[PDB]
Write a protein that binds this ligand. Structure first.
Ligand code: HEM
Ligand code: HEM
Lengths: 149, 149
């Protein structure tokens, strides 16, 4: 039941289109808010420079490049949620970076709150809905499993 | 006095030539021994997979790629120790990865012991000497400062 309905896939694709024209900005907004709200990430991300604010980090090539990388895994999963197992072997080595010992498990929940917040910011008020909220949350759950397992 | 004598530069260049034909193997030998002797590096290197031995990690593309990266910084410094400040801005972002909080400071000493051990393994017994030992140790000290400061 790690499967989304066809209607959930479709609601997601409809927000992916809204996000596509500014997709890189969207993903950097997410990582910047995540780092603002969870300051311990400046010790977990090796490239993060603890003498700078998240917003100062946003200019750094290593912030941009980490956002582009997670941005790609998320994009590839969102666009075909049920067929996500095709990405299995290219993913593969993510598991070892995301163990409980390296990444405190409650940070996954936090990062999903940040994705949902930036999604709400880019989607129109008229289009956002409870059903979309549940489709994105379920989607985030599947992406989570791919990156940890 | 972060400066090596011309004679120390020259003793180093003479070992760099011995290492060049197998340089990548040499640097992977170093990282593999470092990870065998200091098991906590499997929590510090994010890509390291704690369910595997260092030697099993050696096959992984992320082990090979991390060894190639440190291998390049070391090579570039060794070949012109006194003029190392030319590399300053390409280095730059290494500092934030190597703070005391992210990397326990006594591990620098450990990693330098591993470089010296693999250097002794590749250099002939007839050529290795006390003066070379001191030239490499001093060289390692300068490379250390470049990567932390
Ligand atoms: C399901 C959500 C997540 C996705 C899709 C994701 C994606 C990725 C990807 C693709 C990489 C490898 C990037 C590269 O090769 O440079 C990565 C690395 C990493 N991630 Fe995640 N990640 C997620 C959750 C988290 C969380 C919550 C944290 C907490 C800080 C986190 C921390 C890390 C760390 C420490 C690494 C090695 C990171 C790095 O090397 O900068 N990840 N992630
Ligand atoms: C003077 C000796 C050292 C040199 C020349 C060196 C070199 C480098 C380089 C060039 C990088 C960036 C590679 C990249 O962009 O992917 C790096 C990252 C890193 N280094 Fe070092 N390093 C040294 C000492 C250490 C020590 C003793 C440790 C202890 C574990 C260490 C742990 C790390 C960590 C956690 C990172 C981020 C590493 C990674 O992202 O895998 N380094 N180092």
């Amino acid at each position: 039941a790690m499967q989304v309905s066809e209607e959930q896939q479709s609601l997601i694709m409809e927000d992916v289109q809204v996000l596509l024209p500014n997709y890189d900005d969207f993903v950097e907004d997410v990582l910047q808010q995540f780092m603002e709200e969870n300051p311990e990430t400046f010790q977990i991300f090796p490239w993060a420079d603890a003498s700078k604010t998240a917003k100062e980090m946003r200019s750094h090539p290593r912030f941009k490049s980490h956002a582009k990388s997670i941005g790609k895994v998320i994009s590839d999963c969102l666009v075909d949620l049920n067929g996500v197992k095709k990405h299995e072997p290219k993913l593969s080595s993510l598991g070892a970076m995301h163990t409980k010992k390296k990444v405190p498990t409650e940070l996954f929940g936090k990062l999903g709150g940040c994705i949902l917040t930036q999604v709400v910011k880019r989607v129109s008020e008229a289009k956002w809905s409870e059903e979309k909220k549940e489709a994105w949350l379920k989607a985030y759950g599947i992406i989570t499993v791919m990156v940890t397992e």
